[PDB]
Design a protein around this nucleic acid. Structure first.
Ligand SMILES: [Mg+2]
Ligand SMILES: [Mg+2]
Ligand SMILES: [Zn+2]
Ligand SMILES: [Zn+2]
Ligand SMILES: [Zn+2]
Lengths: 310, 417, 515
RNA sequence: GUGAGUAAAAUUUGG
RNA sequence: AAAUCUUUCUCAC
């Protein structure tokens, strides 16, 4: 009788995802038949005319990128760019404006994009797609916590470095590695070598933050000793090398293992959920009072339905 | 009405209000909040909408009337409800992940686990194979590649001319002459003429592979881009001669000859005989009203034609040139000829890799990359990776493989690594 | 030409191989190879290593992601005409819909819950039974996987039953979770280059690096190995059912059903096959069949070989090799210090598949090349200009365009030939936004998508439920009356503001234009 | 140019 | 005829 009955025969109720899967039309595939398909019946010609006369004069004019910083070729590394999704109210407003609901809903989820980049700047800033060589940077400080991520077992948003996930070390990071019979402490700017004579931690700069962390980990007494030296260290290589981030919280010493006898340290580390259901007034519903305890109401200052929890 | 949800609904509505302060959701598991004098048809009753909400696990429907609103709780910390308000309410209130009994675990043991395991045991099982002996040796040398090339050359030999590969050079005729020559060649071969187009008719097939040899390299390929564009165009516009600035071709659909009503138009799977021209001087010369040209044909199925026609010759050449060493001059047979060789032949080789739909040169390139990056390889097995004749069949693929091996040999000879 | 590159080049600048050859011969060869391995005369298929270290996920809740279960990709559906079996090639979405209709289950998770809790195999779930489901889910259809660079003779892939797809999806999700738990190198968020760099660091300690591939990987992974791994990670009866179906699998070659007791049919289970090895040792970085390890002395090499043999990962003597200065994994080649090796590498050309989509693909490829340091920026600009010229040569014809507007590309009858830097910087006429790699889809892409939606295997008379409110879950149940109601409401609201089609949304442009 | 049928109707071709 | 089990279908409006 109805196409619904013919398709979902024996079922009067089906999930929206299943229903939509039957009418998916926005999936593109690169195939050998593209030229023939475009030629057939001048479909591409007609689509181009329709876009020029109906769709072209609707695209907003966005500004061009201008900010760029001096950059120099460096070792290959991974750049993570975090694009936040749309907030509920913004998505609802866009839907009301008459925008394609599917695309707006699809972008609600936060995105993380991985790109290999072989260029870096002094400030260690991100770069636009394909413009790392020139130096165009994403001028966007998304409140880069990196303290929350380092302590949390599973960071909410990896930053592309060992503090928050797989990657290398950052400016405010350091590592302690036992090479042979010595402890190399590196912070990215100063490298020091430490050793224990009987019960102390003999090093050139005992006052070093990493030296203090190593002494606390080993339970020793810091002592100044310029005589302590190392033949050579790969500390630069390990600093620029990328390790895997374990899904385990920090040790009582605050260090998370990254390699054998190696730990990473971070200097900086030692109501109601008002929800907006929709941007419309639902008929047969209460008006928002001054003290809405826990219910849903309609706000007059903002034309929306607000739900108050706890 | 199941007690396992009593807690789940108990926290579903902490202090929600509907009129002034009165509870919006009344729980059916509690005497104080339950509505007396009415039957229970849901876990909770919403007074504002006068509806009923029932909580059930993922894929575990409950015996409730269709009127009652169902609020499924997925196993992935997401919830369901027919009403957006209730969905948001339960999503916000259930921030605490409280495990509910009756949820099926991935390790669940079904009542038929034993029977299926017994059936699997009764079924056949594999036998332990032999442990292989692996000898690590240095990668192949120039001599091994030379032996491979010599084996190919001896087994297959060479064609007198370059066949269709010669079509990358001008035939010396004008557009009118080219069109007339192509149409007269089509007429000579008894090709059917219909709807202003040419069609090739076949009845029986020998079912034997066509004789395959190696194509000698012409001097150069200035018309590679034009040839590829024309090949891309023709098979989608088959039947009539197609023209370019300096060359023309003719793609004739090949269809069966049944009888009075056999077939009049080509179908998505119909193959095409592509005809091109080159300078005379081979066994394929065709003469008509004082115009002579060597006519070369190539039989392509739609996928092969689409693959060949869509390749970008100029951009590929530029990208290769970006980071290349000096290319030595080579002879017709691909040998190094510093005295009379030409560098332009390399372009021809590139054209060949575009015309070969099997792209065996890609396999050769991957193996050569492994060879260059390798310090030690398995004895007698790594070398076999260069023997790809069994993997391909045809004149063009065979020539492409041979010239890929020749390129490897030349790279080893001229710029040892 | 690829041979004379100073750096490393895989010769990816051309398209992969293709042909109209029938997939019968390749599938028959694969089945014969699997049978030969089953006899213990060609390669090992008996798993000997110990998988006790693997954690048990038996207590984890059974969760299914509906989205992965529906797709426009092909699948096999089995029906009974009068006693014989008929295998039909449908779309995975249609196959899942048919399975749910037969079992009368609203959602696939409900189907799994019902199947796992039947008192017997003979019990009826809707219009079928678990025995009938197991019998039907062992049928596969053979197709040809083409456009695989470096493979002149195309390989054969297999379309499976919706029930098999359901169980495989569940088990593979859990196997991927177990892998991520075993080693941090297997995070969900890890690119090929990122994984290669992490492997490079893991291997930098030792002297020799063994880069290995496994020969005939699919055929050497027997159902017994899969069952062993699934029992180790605690899969319960789901793993038993999957192993039973795999052992009894039948492949439809042309018009005949052929039994294939051995193997897993070309990548049905990649995470499980990986766990088969990763669960026995820790000195391996492996993905599917491509692995890398490091060693110092021949004794370590012998230990590595013994581990590989015991894990049913038959080393490929034709491709595996030892290096000291290079590290190859996931097709990415690095130096021992983690840097990318100089040369084209895996850079691939963009074939002419449209006037605008080709430019977008070329822009993406050049952006990737310049960002990673494969080539300098000016070279990328030159290549982009050359590509625009070639596109103008190909597509500047009446058959593709009857316009002559100045701001159009030369390939669409215009005159402007934009520069790579200008395009990437958004210093262009809005019409060029679609050519940006992050811009909206091109005209040709939409044309091809809409044409594809009307093909025989995907065409449907159902009233499309598109442009949904972004608050309604995609997993909610709806009926025909509900679909009509929401569609009418959306159309009425659209008419109230003066539109007939929704406005295409692009997040990048929207965010950029935001004050 | 529309739909229907066959172990398939070209987004063909799967993980 | 050739890159040789491929160059192929049926019905209604
Ligand atoms: Mg392999
Ligand atoms: Mg491999
Ligand atoms: Zn961080
Ligand atoms: Zn050091
Ligand atoms: Zn000739």
């Amino acid at each position: 009788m109805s196409q619904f009955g013919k398709s979902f025969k024996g079922r009067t109720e089906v999930t929206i995802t299943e229903y939509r899967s039957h009418t998916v039309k926005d999936v593109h595939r690169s195939l050998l038949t593209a030229d023939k398909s475009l030629r057939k019946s001048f479909c591409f010609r007609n689509a181009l005319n329709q876009f020029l006369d109906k769709d072209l004069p609707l695209l907003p004019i966005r500004p061009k990128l201008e900010s760029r910083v001096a950059v120099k070729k460096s070792k290959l590394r991974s750049q993570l760019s975090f694009r936040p999704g749309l907030t509920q109210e913004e998505a609802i407003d866009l839907y009301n404006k008459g925008y394609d609901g599917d695309s707006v809903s699809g972008a609600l989820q936060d995105r993380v994009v991985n790109e290999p980049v072989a260029y870096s700047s002094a400030d260690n800033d991100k770069f636009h797609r394909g413009l790392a060589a020139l130096g165009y940077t994403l001028a966007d400080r998304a409140f880069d916590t990196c303290e929350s991520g380092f302590v949390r077992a599973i960071p909410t948003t990896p930053c592309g470095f060992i503090c928050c996930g797989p990657g290398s070390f950052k400016d405010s990071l350091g590592f302690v590695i036992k090479i042979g019979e010595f402890w190399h402490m590196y912070d990215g700017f100063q490298h020091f070598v430490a050793v224990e004579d009987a019960k102390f931690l003999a090093s050139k700069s005992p006052s070093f933050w990493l030296a203090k962390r190593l002494a606390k980990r080993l339970n020793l007494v810091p002592k100044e000793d310029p005589s302590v030296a190392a033949a050579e260290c790969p500390c630069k290589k390990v600093w620029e090398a990328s390790f895997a981030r374990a899904p385990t919280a920090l040790d009582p010493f605050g260090g998370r293992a990254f390699c054998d006898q190696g730990w990473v340290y971070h200097r900086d580390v030692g109501k109601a959920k008002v929800t907006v259901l929709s941007r419309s007034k639902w008929m047969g519903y209460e008006d928002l009072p001054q003290k809405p305890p826990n219910g849903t109401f309609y706000c007059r200052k903002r034309k929306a339905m607000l739900l108050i929890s706890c | 009405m199941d007690s396992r949800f009593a807690q789940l609904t108990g926290v579903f509505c902490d202090d929600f209000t509907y009129s002034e302060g009165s509870r919006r959701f009344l729980s059916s598991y509690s005497t104080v909040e339950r509505r007396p004098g009415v039957p229970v048809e849901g876990d909770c009753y919403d007074c504002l909408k006068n509806k009923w909400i029932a909580f059930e696990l993922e894929g575990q429907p409950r015996k409730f009337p269709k009127a009652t609103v169902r609020c499924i709780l997925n196993n992935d910390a997401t919830y369901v409800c027919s009403e957006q308000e209730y969905q948001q309410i339960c999503k916000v209130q259930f921030k605490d992940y409280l495990e509910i009994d009756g949820v099926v675990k991935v390790g669940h043991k079904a009542s038929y686990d034993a029977e299926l395991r017994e059936r699997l045991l009764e079924l056949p099982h594999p036998k332990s194979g032999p442990k292989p002996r692996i000898e690590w040796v240095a990668p192949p040398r120039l001599a091994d590649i030379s032996k491979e090339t010599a084996e190919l050359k001896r087994q297959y030999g060479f064609f007198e001319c370059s066949k269709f590969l010669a079509c990358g050079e001008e035939c010396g005729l004008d557009q009118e002459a080219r069109e007339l020559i192509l149409n007269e060649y089509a007429r000579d071969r008894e090709f059917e003429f219909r709807n202003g187009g040419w069609i090739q008719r076949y009845t029986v097939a020998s079912h034997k592979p066509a004789t395959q040899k190696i194509l000698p390299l012409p001097a150069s390929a200035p018309l590679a881009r034009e040839l590829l564009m024309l090949i891309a165009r023709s098979t989608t516009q088959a039947g009539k001669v197609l023209h370019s600035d300096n060359t023309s071709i003719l793609a004739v659909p090949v269809m069966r000859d049944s009888g009075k009503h056999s077939k009049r138009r080509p179908t998505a799977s119909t193959h095409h005989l592509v005809v091109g021209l080159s300078k005379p001087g081979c066994e394929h010369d065709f003469e008509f009203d004082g115009y002579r040209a060597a006519v070369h044909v190539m039989h392509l199925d739609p996928k092969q034609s689409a693959n060949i026609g869509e390749q970008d010759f100029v951009s590929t050449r530029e990208i290769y040139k970006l980071d290349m060493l000096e290319l030595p001059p080579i002879s017709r047979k691909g040998d190094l000829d510093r005295a009379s060789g030409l560098e332009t032949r390399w372009d021809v080789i590139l054209l060949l890799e575009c015309l070969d739909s099997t792209r065996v040169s890609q396999a050769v390139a991957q193996h050569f990359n492994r060879h260059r990056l390798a310090l030690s390889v398995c004895k007698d097995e790594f070398r076999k990776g260069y023997q790809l004749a069994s993997e391909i069949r045809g004149t063009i693929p065979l020539s492409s493989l041979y010239y890929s091996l020749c390129a490897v040999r030349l790279r080893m000879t001229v710029h040892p690594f | 030409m690829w041979a004379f590159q100073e750096g490393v080049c895989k010769g990816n600048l051309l398209s992969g191989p293709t042909s109209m050859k029938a997939p019968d011969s390749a599938a028959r060869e694969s089945i014969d190879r699997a049978s030969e391995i089953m006899t213990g005369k060609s390669y090992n298929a008996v798993h000997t290593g110990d998988l006790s270290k693997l954690p048990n996920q038996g207590e984890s809740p059974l969760r299914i992601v509906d989205s992965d279960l529906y797709s426009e990709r092909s699948c096999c559906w089995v029906i009974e005409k009068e006693g014989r079996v008929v295998c039909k090639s449908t779309t995975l979405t249609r196959g899942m819909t048919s399975l749910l209709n037969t079992t009368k289950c609203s959602s696939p998770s409900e189907l799994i819950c019902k199947v796992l809790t039947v008192e017997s195999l003979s019990e009826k779930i809707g219009d079928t039974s678990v025995e009938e489901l197991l019998s039907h889910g062992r049928y596969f259809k053979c197709a040809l996987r083409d456009q695989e660079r470096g493979k002149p003779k195309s390989r054969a892939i297999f379309l499976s039953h919706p029930f098999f797809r359901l169980l495989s999806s569940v088990v593979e999700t859990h196997a991927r979770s177990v892998l991520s738990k075993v080693s941090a190198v297997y995070t969900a968020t890890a690119s090929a280059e990122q994984r290669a760099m992490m492997a490079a660091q893991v291997v930098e300690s030792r002297k020799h690096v063994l880069n290995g591939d496994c020969t005939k990987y699919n055929e050497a992974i027997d159902a017994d190995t899969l069952l062993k791994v699934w029992d180790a990670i605690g899969m319960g009866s789901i793993g038993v059912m999957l192993a039973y179906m795999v052992r009894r699998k039948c492949v439809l070659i042309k018009d005949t059903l052929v039994e294939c007791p051995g193997g897993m049919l070309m990548g049905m289970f990649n995470a499980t096959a990986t766990l088969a090895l990763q669960g026995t040792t820790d000195r391996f970085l492996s993905f599917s069949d491509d692995f890398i390890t490091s060693f110092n002395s021949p004794a370590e090499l012998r230990e590595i070989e013994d581990l590989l043999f015991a894990s049913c990962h038959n080393l490929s003597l034709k491709k595996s090799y030892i290096s000291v200065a290079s590290l190859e994994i996931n097709s990415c080649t690095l130096t021992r210090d983690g840097d990318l090796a100089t040369g084209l590498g895996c850079t691939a050309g963009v074939p002419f598949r449209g006037p605008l989509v080709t430019l977008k693909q070329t822009a993406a490829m050049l952006s990737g090349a310049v960002d990673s340091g494969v080539m300098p920026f000016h070279s990328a600009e030159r290549l982009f200009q050359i590509k625009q010229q070639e596109c103008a040569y190909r597509y500047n014809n009446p058959t593709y365009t009857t316009r002559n507007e100045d701001f159009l590309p030369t390939c669409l009858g215009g005159k402007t030939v934009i520069s790579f830097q200008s395009l990437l910087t958004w210093d262009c006429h809005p019409f060029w936004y679609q050519v940006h790699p992050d811009g909206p889809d091109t005209i040709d892409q939409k044309v091809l998508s809409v044409l594809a939606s009307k093909t025989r295997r995907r065409r449907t008379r159902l009233e499309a439920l598109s442009d949904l409110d972004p608050l309604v879950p995609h997993r909610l149940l709806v009926s025909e009356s509900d679909v009509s109601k929401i569609r009418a409401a959306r159309q009425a609201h659209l008419k109230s503001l003066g539109l007939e089609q929704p406005t295409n949304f692009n997040y990048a442009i929207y965010k950029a234009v935001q004050p």
